[PDB]
Amino acid sequence: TAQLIDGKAIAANLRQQIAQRVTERRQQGLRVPGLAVILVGTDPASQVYVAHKRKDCEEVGFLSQAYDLPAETSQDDLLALIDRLNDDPAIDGILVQLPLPAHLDASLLLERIHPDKDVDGFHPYNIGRLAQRMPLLRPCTPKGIMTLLASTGADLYGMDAVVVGASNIVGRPMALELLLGGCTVTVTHRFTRDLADHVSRADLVVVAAGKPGLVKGEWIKEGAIVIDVGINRQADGRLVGDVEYEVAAQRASWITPVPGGVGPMTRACLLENTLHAAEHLHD
Amino acid sequence: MTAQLIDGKAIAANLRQQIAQRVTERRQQGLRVPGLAVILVGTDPASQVYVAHKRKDCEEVGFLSQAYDLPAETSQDDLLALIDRLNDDPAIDGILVQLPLPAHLDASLLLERIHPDKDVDGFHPYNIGRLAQRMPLLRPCTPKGIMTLLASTGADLYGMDAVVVGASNIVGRPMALELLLGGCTVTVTHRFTRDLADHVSRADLVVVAAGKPGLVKGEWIKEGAIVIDVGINRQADGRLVGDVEYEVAAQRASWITPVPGGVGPMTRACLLENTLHAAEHLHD
């Protein structure tokens, strides 16, 4: 009964729009956006995810620079690579594939990225800027979920929204995006006393919990919008989502099927960030 | 009527002593005294008063003070260079800029020039982002102060339903990030919120920062709730009437802040606490 949000189709529309914009730039003599994607180590998951990023990068016609470093690359060498990419005016976005080898300080390395080239958008400065209602580059997964909400044509102003999975990296950012978008926002987490009462009052539910069946379909308010993205922002391979779909779908006005498009939306908004950076932040 | 009163002025005075006693300990032990550079640009009467308050407190706890009372016409570039020198001075732990600035300066670019490291006010986007991701560097001082007020009640914030009334306010978002880190379930409301009463009346903890007299009705307060009413002026509270209807709220709340209360002293006290922390933990 609920209409379906198709994140995969919206991510494709978004890649298509970015590719066309890039074609309008290149004919106009404007610089093509550059994206450096850095991989360190052997992790099969990370090789697959990085591969999807670069495939999406090529489709959209960005200038791209691959850096497939070996796992024992020093922290300092990696800093010098990030220092050099910041000072390269041909590069608009710098991506450091996660997770990184144990010896590497994850936070130090990621925070070395100029916030205006941090197209993932989770650099602390970027989240802080979102927090104070003037984002530089928005965290791409939350941004991607706002795009999902936008496709429903719903008016978020005054909507009671609930974010389930505060502990997740997307959770706080997601809350800041929804507040920016006009919603009253409740954030819940593992220690929330009565999740059912919070969810049942919500016009909008965003769940990123990685806990199958956590949100009962009975908790969903009639007419609610339900976004179920789990904890993997790069690829959704779940057979069952955090929300119990059947009943949820009987009551929601809009729902994301599971597995859904969180990965493609995340990559699309990542590219969208790279383009914006080029058009707006780098001259 | 029946609510234990949260006294922010007492707590702030108590906190200034501790900073003072710790400074005297460092001074007795030959360790470096924390340094605070306080910048004032222009001559706005309220801004002069507020820096005065900051600098009285700064001298009370025995910090090294550097005062920059600059003229209102001071160039943005000249002010940048001032910030640059202060950033690299090992004697200076905290760099503070009194607001508002004259309108001709890009106040964001200047405030962001400060190393989050020396941002003792704590509202640098980096600092707010670090707080957002559960790994705070220097905590925004007004929200930190509200967390201290709450800690003094002895309450367990874990699984409490908290509501922050004032998203508009510069404190609102950081308040929410503080409350979440403290383990509350947190709802943030603002001018487009529907049924504000329903959100407030479900809350075990209400933090209001609206600058709107009587906005939150005392009848909306949950029985046994903790109620913090700090208005929208972080440096002073001169309201005759608060955001919460005090008389009725006091009959229902377990703890409540009187109004006019201690948001200002608490804010300055936590700013000073961040300077000490900077000195003891972030610098040499």
Author numbering:
A (entry chain A): 2 to 284
B (entry chain B): 1 to 284
Task: Show sentences the authors wrote.
Inspection of folate metabolism in P. aeruginosa drew our attention to the bifunctional enzyme methylenetetrahydrofolate dehydrogenase - cyclohydrolase. The enzymes that synthesize, link and modify tetrahydrofolate (THF) maintain the cellular levels of important cofactors such as methenyl-, methylene-, formyl- and unsubstituted THF. The gene encoding this cytosolic enzyme, folD, has been shown by knock-out studies to be essential in the Gram-positive Bacillus subtilis, as well as the Gram-negative Escherichia coli, Francisella novicida, Acinetobacter baylyi, and in P. aeruginosa itself. The PaFolD subunit consists of 284 residues arranged as a two domain structure, each with an α/β fold, connected by two long helices.
Ordered crystals were obtained and the structure of PaFolD, with four molecules in the asymmetric unit, was solved using a monomer of EcFolD as the search model for molecular replacement calculations. The structure was subsequently refined to 2.2 Å resolution. The four monomers, labelled A–D, are arranged as two homodimers, consistent with the observation of dimeric species in size exclusion gel chromatography and with previously determined FolD structures. In addition a loop, residues 233–241, is disordered in chain D, whilst it is ordered in the other subunits. Detailed comparison of the PaFolD structure with other FolD structures, in particular EcFolD indicates that a loop linking β8 and α10 (residues 231–243) is significantly different and occludes the active site. Since the recombinant PaFolD retains catalytic activity we assign the loop conformation as an artefact of crystallization but which nonetheless indicates a flexibility likely relevant to the enzyme activity. A number of interactions serve to position the flexible 231–243 loop in the active site. These include a salt bridge formed between Asp121 and Arg234. Complementary stabilizing associations involve van der Waals interactions between the side chains of Tyr50 and Gln235 together with a hydrogen bond donated from Arg268 NH1 to the carbonyl group of Gln235. These associations would not be formed in the presence of substrate, which would directly interact with Asp121 and Tyr50.
